Amino acid sequence: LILSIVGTSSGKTTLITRMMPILRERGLRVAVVKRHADSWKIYNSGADVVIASPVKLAFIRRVSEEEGNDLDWIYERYLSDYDLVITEGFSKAGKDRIVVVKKPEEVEHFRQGRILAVVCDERVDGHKWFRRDEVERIAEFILSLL
Amino acid sequence: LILSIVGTSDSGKTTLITRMMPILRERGLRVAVVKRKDSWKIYNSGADVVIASPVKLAFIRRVSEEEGNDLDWIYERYLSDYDLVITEGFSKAGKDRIVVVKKPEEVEHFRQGRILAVVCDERVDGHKWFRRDEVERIAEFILSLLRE
Numbered sequence A: 001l002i003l004s005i006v007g008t009s010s011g012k013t014t015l016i017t018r019m020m021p022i023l024r025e026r027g028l029r030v031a032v033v034k035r036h037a038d039s040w041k042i043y044n045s046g047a048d049v050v051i052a053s054p055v056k057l058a059f060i061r062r063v064s065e066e067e068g069n070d071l072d073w074i075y076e077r078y079l080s081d082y083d084l085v086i087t088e089g090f091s092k093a094g095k096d097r098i099v100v101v102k103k104p105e106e107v108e109h110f111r112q113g114r115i116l117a118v119v120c121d122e123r124v125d126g127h128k129w130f131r132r133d134e135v136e137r138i139a140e141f142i143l144s145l146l
Numbered sequence B: 001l002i003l004s005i006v007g008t009s010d011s012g013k014t015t016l017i018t019r020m021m022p023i024l025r026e027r028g029l030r031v032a033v034v035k036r037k038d039s040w041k042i043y044n045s046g047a048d049v050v051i052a053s054p055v056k057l058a059f060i061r062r063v064s065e066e067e068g069n070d071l072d073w074i075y076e077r078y079l080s081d082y083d084l085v086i087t088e089g090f091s092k093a094g095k096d097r098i099v100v101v102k103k104p105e106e107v108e109h110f111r112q113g114r115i116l117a118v119v120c121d122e123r124v125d126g127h128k129w130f131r132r133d134e135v136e137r138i139a140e141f142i143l144s145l146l147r148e
Ligand SMILES: [Cl-]
Pocket: B005, B006, B007, B008, B088, B089, B090, B091
């Protein structure tokens, strides 16, 4: 499953990070794609880099514009083994999304794909509506989607 | 093809790699090097993380210790479309290697795989030999082995 969590400036991050223990406890492997719209010397010289450590691996590579803006390429190439892929932002990709906002009027901004739910403290009309701190229920909602 | 750059000077390995890189790349070779705040928060919470931008992508992910130590596992997941993979270290993995040392007798400590050449300011016996400065010659040597 690929799902976008989108909305206004750090409410999105808190939701993702707070839901994460619950999603992982159910046995999901999860990746999060965040778009920005030494090893540096090596990278800067022309090489893509893997940095390997006992418990963490990092891979930094040049991509063409067409690759870097292509969510489904990124997924097919590197994330095909994951149960759940969540984007933070990547709204233009038109994936089904959860919209996380401060004010209900902001929801309107994010109709670039299908709105599965809205997370807001104030009443949101016209959508399935979760309050920001209902992390368990929102996680359960995502688990239902699969 | 995976080539290790091994030896006694951390800085001299890294310098040889970066000086050679523009020459290797001008041949339209695709090269990768393997070496030993919100995305950090997401990572800590238990997600693997992709940071995407129009021309650069970073994939940060949890591994077991054996996976992270395993060059072939890394090659498969990540590196199968490169024309050349360079390793900075990983001497004990036994890949063919270029050995970069200060003193000729240090060469003896890097015999875990095939020694293709030795980089040393002082002449070394029993191996193909370049000085530290001969970056174009060492780069070409690497291009040559690729074409065989
Ligand atoms: Cl080494």
